[PDB]
Design a protein around this ligand. Structure first.
Ligand SMILES: Nc1ncnc2c1ncn2[C@@H]1O[C@H](COP(=O)(O)OP(=O)(O)OP(O)(O)=S)[C@@H](O)[C@H]1O
Ligand SMILES: Nc1ncnc2c1ncn2[C@@H]1O[C@H](COP(=O)(O)OP(=O)(O)OP(O)(O)=S)[C@@H](O)[C@H]1O
Ligand SMILES: [Mg+2]
Ligand SMILES: [Mg+2]
Lengths: 106, 452, 493
């Protein structure tokens, strides 16, 4: 696993300090030597940490959107997709939210 | 290390990855540490819980939202570091330097160096944790200020006894994606879950609802003796779950937009328990269904306290900045001709793009004055000439509307009103124009009937 | 007492007087003889610079070790000559016919940087000081005004009046003092002064008043100054000075042209006359060479190496400093080879040749951007490949970022056959693990934006929308094409 994470670090950001910031909370959160040994055997932290580094960019916080907010975002992207240069406003967005939801209740 | 990890209820990765980066030995500690999150995502709570669980290491709490530009930030850093050291190691001769002497980043470096080289009389090297809570919440912020705080430990001396270790706190994630090649340890804080918000609110709020005397006077106003502490906390948690499942689609995953809804709708919910609504969960919700359908957050009869000619000026400016200028001699021209002429035919096809969704148009003041005396009601036996002309009062009310930011214009800086190149526009929405036209009883719904 | 709106706690003011030279005596008929005054013209307390001298000297200790090539690397530093004769003679005659005739001339030299103009001007002034010591002429006080050695471009007045008079005023009092001293004081009580205006095109600021005054004090009959102003472009008063000040500067305009390969070969010959083909008594134990265990060693700084170092630098810009930098880098390369081959360390004959100086001639003709974009990451090369093949479709050089994103996604989805890209397209979007959803951007996207933004390959415009932020290739497109053709995977992908 350690060589595989180094191999995917070599194709992504090709840098040793990113590996250092990966390895440091692995060595520092461990409590016993056998725990550190299996933690660097499995690399049970270089996917916990590496999941958390992407936890809110444009996908891990769209995952935490609510339902009305998602319908508003979908309608706004529809309105911008329909326009020429991609601009819209709150009136053009709400004139797609009620139209979509009336077609849902239809 | 010897740090104590706190028992924060729903940030379990973050306190472990926070005790792996904050220690009392300055060698096993990074020189910069970002805690990027969003609003309400638990940054300050878990930071204060960590630093209170570890009393031995030293914190400097600094919030760059009440320190607007960068110069009070440098002055506040140089002030509070010295004030923290004065109350930490008191028996050292501490010559007070003025924090107002700091005017540039270099003078912050020089001042902090002169502060630190007078504490060489210690025994072992320590770190001081300067926390910039809300570094993206700086008001007059630029993209190159953060480079001046990354490369500050490059200037403080290496064989010194007090080393500055920063802990930032960001909020925006397009700010942080500029300082990505600097490879600072970033501990990201993802947005809370509905299952986690619904119990964060319970563990935060159900102490200050049983200790809220509007209920503890209701239990004796209603002669309620079938109660215990469970019989209070269950209706408290049930009310909080009711606000959650009622209003989560409204707010989102924000603790702050739920805290104030709970603060608003609590005594109007205690005023609906009578004698046995505390035992059941459903007929109490059916006794207070009115405060779980609509949010009721606004600050609430009439619409505007304006004159009659100013209301008709607002209506006429709303008309001429949404109507195309060619089609007005079909809508307003009404008087009998004496000479051979033809009126405007009007638009053939109704355009269904609904122009009153957009930004308005720009008109000359003669078109506003012409549409103003067309839509004006009759006033005032052949020397009256009842069609009202624009006297002083019309121009004065028009300038009052421009002052009140209701009609507006192309804001060039200190524009002249008396130019034939300055055009005007309305910046009030439709939803107040309908109330205005309802107030003066003007049929304006059939003015935009040929669009939708 | 008072509450102030802001503070200026860190303020430092000099100790400089405000009343000029015009209000010393207020008597033009009773001005004393300014030449043999105690304070004027540097006659008193001229230790005013040598206060800081015994600070940068510590221990005279520990037996520093020279080598066989440390001598040449010392003789190739900043220091008749067969280089400038027709300029030296004309400048010294044009500045001698005013010293002898009590005149007020102005000489104008110019040239691209390195052609020895400040060296010949300072040698002209040294020779005229020798003539003053031989007393065939009167004496002068020498003032060098460097255009870039001052924090304010109006401090020329302060340093000129300070050098003339021993008193320091502010700049307004100094310009009024110098105006009075160069207009009204008669030519019996002033000895002449020569002014070197080093790097003139850095005091043209906002009024052209300094350029006015230093060339309009020389149109006076009663002012004995000679301005020998140097420049960095021949047509400077036709570009950035007024036509009246062009008429002030006049018609002399002696250009210092570039050097030739013969002149440069003679220059390096005179620099190494004392060391080439001579004999040194080195020691096997350390390497400490001493010119006239012990080994008598020659030193052949070969003439073919000198002339092949000289022909290229004579072509490009012709600088007698860049020739010394080339021939010092050659000696550095030789010393490094010598020390690594012998294990000497700091505390047969030796040669410098053609295939040894070609490294010093090739160290400045390498674009280390191709050997940078080859060693770049795979995602950064994929970024550059998406930007490069969007250009043939668009024709703008200024592609958006939302387009680069969808082009990267297009390449990854349309190559679903290659074993390399199916191994890498899992990690490229999910960091090789589950419990990570498929991200919209690839992993390391802001990283490989910033790693090219800071390096100057990439060029992004500032905006808040990272779908319509335009992005330009700041280096080139041809070198990106020649750097994307050695990957073995992007050559087909
Ligand atoms: N895990 C938790 N356990 C208990 N209470 C919590 C928890 N998370 C949040 N809270 C409460 O909700 C509040 C959230 O505020 P903060 O923790 O300061 O979040 P925040 O990110 O600092 O907000 P900003 O960034 O200053 S706008 C805390 O003050 C607590 O009252
Ligand atoms: N004929 C020469 N003989 C010896 N040294 C020379 C000669 N020509 C140029 N140099 C070198 O150039 C230096 C003198 O500076 P110059 O090049 O004359 O000033 P410049 O030409 O004005 O350059 P700039 O642009 O002002 S930095 C000396 O240190 C010499 O090493
Ligand atoms: Mg906070
Ligand atoms: Mg020079």
């Amino acid at each position: 696993n350690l060589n595989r994470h180094i191999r995917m670090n070599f194709e992504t950001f090709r840098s040793l300090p990113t590996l250092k910031n990966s390895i440091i909370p692995l060595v520092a959160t461990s409590k016993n030597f056998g725990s550190l040994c299996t933690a660097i055997k499995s690399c049970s932290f270089l996917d916990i940490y590496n999941k958390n580094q992407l936890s809110n960019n444009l996908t891990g916080r769209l995952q935490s959107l609510s339902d009305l907010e998602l319908a508003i975002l979908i309608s706004a992207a529809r309105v911008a997709l329909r326009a020429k240069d991609g601009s819209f406003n709150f009136n053009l967005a709400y004139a797609e939210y009620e139209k979509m939801i009336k077609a849902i209740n239809s | 290390m010897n740090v104590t990890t706190p028992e924060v209820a729903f940030r379990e990765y973050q306190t472990n990855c926070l005790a792996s980066y904050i220690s009392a030995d300055p060698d096993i500690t990074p020189s910069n540490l970002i805690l990027q999150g969003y609003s309400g995502t638990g940054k300050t709570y878990t930071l204060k819980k960590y630093f209170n669980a570890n009393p031995n290491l030293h914190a400097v709490w600094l919030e760059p939202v009440e320190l607007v530009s960068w110069k009070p930030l440098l002055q506040a850093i140089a002030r509070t570091v010295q004030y923290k050291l004065k109350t930490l190691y008191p028996n050292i001769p501490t010559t007070d330097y003025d924090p107002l002497q700091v005017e540039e980043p270099f003078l912050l470096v020089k001042t902090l160096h002169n502060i630190f080289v007078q504490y060489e009389s210690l025994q072992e090297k320590t770190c001081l944790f300067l926390i910039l809570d809300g570094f993206d919440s700086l008001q007059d912020l630029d993209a190159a200020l953060f480079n001046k705080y990354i490369k500050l430990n490059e200037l403080l001396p290496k064989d010194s006894k007090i080393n500055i270790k920063f802990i930032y706190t960001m909020l925006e994630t397009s700010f942080l994606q500029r300082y990505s090649t600097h490879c600072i340890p970033t501990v990201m804080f993802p947005r809370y879950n509905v299952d986690e918000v619904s119990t964060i609110l319970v563990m935060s709020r159900c102490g200050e609802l049983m200790e809220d005397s509007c209920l503890r006077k209701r239990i004796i106003e209603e002669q309620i003796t079938d109660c215990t502490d469970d019989q209070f906390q269950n209706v408290a948690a049930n009310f909080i779950h009711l606000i959650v499942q009622a209003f989560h689609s409204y707010t989102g995953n924000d603790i702050f937009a739920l805290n104030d809804l709970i603060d608003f709708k609590w005594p109007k919910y205690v005023s609906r328990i009578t004698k046995e609504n505390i035992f059941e969960p459903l007929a109490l919700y059916k006794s207070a269904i009115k405060l779980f359908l609509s949010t009721d957050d606004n600050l609430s009869s009439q619409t505007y306290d304006l004159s009659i000619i100013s209301k008709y000026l607002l209506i006429a400016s709303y008309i001429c900045s949404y109507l195309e200028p060619r089609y007005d001699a079909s809508i307003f021209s009404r008087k009998t001709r004496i000479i051979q002429g033809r009126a405007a035919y009007g638009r053939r096809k109704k355009k269904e793009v609904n122009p009153r969704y957009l930004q308005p148009s720009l008109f000359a003041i003669e078109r506003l004055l012409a549409i103003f005396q067309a839509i004006f009601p009759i006033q005032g036996a052949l020397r009256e000439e009842s069609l009202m002309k624009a006297n002083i009062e019309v121009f004065q009310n028009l300038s009052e509307l421009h002052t009140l930011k209701l009609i507006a214009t192309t804001m060039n800086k200190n524009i002249d009103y008396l130019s034939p190149k300055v055009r005007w526009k309305v910046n009030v929405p439709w939803e107040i124009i309908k109330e205005i036209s309802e107030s003066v009883h003007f049929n304006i719904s059939d003015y935009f009937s040929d669009i939708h | 007492p008072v509450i102030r709106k802001f503070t200026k706690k860190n303020v430092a003011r000099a100790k400089k007087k405000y009343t000029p030279f015009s209000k010393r005596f207020k008597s033009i008929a009773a001005i004393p003889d300014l030449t043999s005054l105690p304070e004027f013209y540097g006659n008193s307390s001229e230790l005013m610079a040598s206060r800081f001298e015994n600070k940068l000297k510590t221990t005279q200790k520990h037996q520093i070790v020279e080598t066989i090539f440390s001598k040449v690397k010392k003789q190739l530093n900043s220091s008749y000559l067969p280089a400038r004769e027709n300029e030296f003679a004309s400048i010294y005659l044009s500045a001698y016919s005013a010293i002898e005739s009590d005149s007020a001339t102005t000489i104008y030299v110019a040239g691209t940087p390195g052609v020895g103009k400040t060296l010949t001007v300072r040698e002209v002034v040294k020779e005229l000081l020798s003539s003053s010591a031989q007393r065939e002429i009167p004496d002068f006080l020498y003032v060098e005004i460097n255009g870039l050695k001052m924090v304010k471009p109006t401090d020329c007045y302060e340093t000129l009046w300070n050098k003339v008079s021993g008193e320091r005023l502010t700049w307004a009092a100094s310009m009024e003092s110098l105006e009075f001293y160069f207009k009204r004081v008669p030519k019996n009580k002033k000895k002449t002064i020569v002014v070197l205006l080093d790097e003139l095109d850095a005091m043209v600021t906002k009024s052209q008043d300094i350029m006015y005054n230093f060339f309009n004090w020389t149109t006076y009959e009663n002012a004995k100054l000679i301005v020998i102003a140097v420049a960095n472009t021949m047509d400077l008063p036709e570009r950035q000075l007024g036509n009246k000040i062009t008429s002030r500067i006049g018609f002399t305009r002696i250009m210092f042209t570039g050097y030739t390969h013969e002149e440069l070969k003679n220059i390096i010959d005179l620099r190494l006359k004392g060391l080439n083909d001579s004999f040194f008594y080195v020691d096997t134990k350390t390497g400490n060479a001493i010119l006239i265990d012990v080994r008598k060693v020659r030193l052949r700084m070969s003439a073919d190496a000198i002339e092949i170092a000289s022909r290229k630098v004579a072509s490009v810009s012709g600088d007698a400093r860049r020739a010394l930098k080339v021939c010092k880098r050659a000696a550095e390369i030789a010393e490094k080879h010598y020390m690594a081959k012998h294990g000497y360390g700091y505390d047969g004959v030796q040669t410098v040749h053609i295939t040894h100086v070609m490294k010093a001639l090739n160290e400045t003709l390498n674009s280390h951007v191709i050997t940078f974009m080859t060693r770049l990451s795979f995602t950064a090369k994929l970024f550059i490949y998406a930007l490069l093949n969007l250009m043939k479709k668009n024709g703008s050089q200024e592609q958006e970022l939302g387009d680069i994103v969808d082009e990267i996604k297009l390449l990854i989805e349309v190559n679903g056959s290659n074993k390399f890209v199916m191994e890498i397209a899992k990690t490229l979007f999910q960091q090789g693990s589950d419990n990570i959803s498929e991200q919209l951007r690839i992993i390391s996207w802001d990283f490989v934006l910033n790693q090219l933004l800071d390096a100057g390959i990439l060029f992004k415009q500032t905006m808040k929308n990272d779908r319509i932020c335009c992005v330009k290739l700041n280096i080139s497109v041809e070198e990106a094409k020649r750097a994307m053709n050695e990957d073995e995977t992007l050559r087909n992908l």
